[PDB]
């Protein structure tokens, strides 16, 4: 079972539209958090 998570969001709309219910963010491609970004770079702002 995998859901209710920013990393589960297929697009960036919910990734940055539901931050209080998720903890992941967009990282150079897929929506993940530092724990996933091996570069240490994490962006949570891309869609308008």
Curated annotation (Swiss-Prot):
It is found in: Membrane. Expressed in normal hepatocytes as well as in epithelial cells lining the stomach, the small and the large intestine. Found also in basal keratinocytes of esophagus and skin. High levels are found in liver, gastrointestinal tract, thyroid and kidney. Also present in the brain. Expressed in metaphyseal bone (at protein level). Disulfide bonds join 6-24, 12-47, 15-31, 27-37. Dephosphorylated by PTPN1 and PTPN2. It comes from the Eukaryota. The kinase domain is involved in SPSB1 binding. The beta-propeller Sema domain mediates binding to HGF. Receptor tyrosine kinase that transduces signals from the extracellular matrix into the cytoplasm by binding to hepatocyte growth factor/HGF ligand. Regulates many physiological processes including proliferation, scattering, morphogenesis and survival. Ligand binding at the cell surface induces autophosphorylation of MET on its intracellular domain that provides docking sites for downstream signaling molecules. Following activation by ligand, interacts with the PI3-kinase subunit PIK3R1, PLCG1, SRC, GRB2, STAT3 or the adapter GAB1. It is linked to Activation of MET after rearrangement with the TPR gene produces an oncogenic protein. Heterodimer made of an alpha chain (50 kDa) and a beta chain (145 kDa) which are disulfide linked. Binds PLXNB1. Interacts when phosphorylated with downstream effectors including STAT3, PIK3R1, SRC, PCLG1, GRB2 and GAB1. Interacts with SPSB1, SPSB2 and SPSB4. Interacts with INPP5D/SHIP1. Interacts with RANBP9 and RANBP10, as well as SPSB1, SPSB2, SPSB3 and SPSB4. SPSB1 binding occurs in the presence and in the absence of HGF, however HGF treatment has a positive effect on this interaction. (Microbial infection) Interacts via extracytoplasmic residues 25-656 with L.monocytogenes InlB; MET can bind HGF, its endogenous ligand, and InlB simultaneously. InlB probably dimerizes upon binding to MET, which encourages subsequent dimerization of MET. Belongs to the protein kinase superfamily. Tyr protein kinase family. This is Hepatocyte growth factor receptor. It comes from Homo sapiens. The lineage of its organism: Eukaryota, Metazoa, Chordata, Craniata, Vertebrata. The gene is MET.
């Amino acid at each position: 079972g995998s859901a209710m998570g920013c990393r589960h969001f297929q697009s960036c709309s919910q990734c940055l539209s539901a931050p209080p219910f998720v903890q992941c963010g967009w990282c150079h491609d897929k929506c993940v958090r530092s724990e996933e970004c091996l570069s240490g770079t994490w962006t949570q702002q891309i869609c308008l």
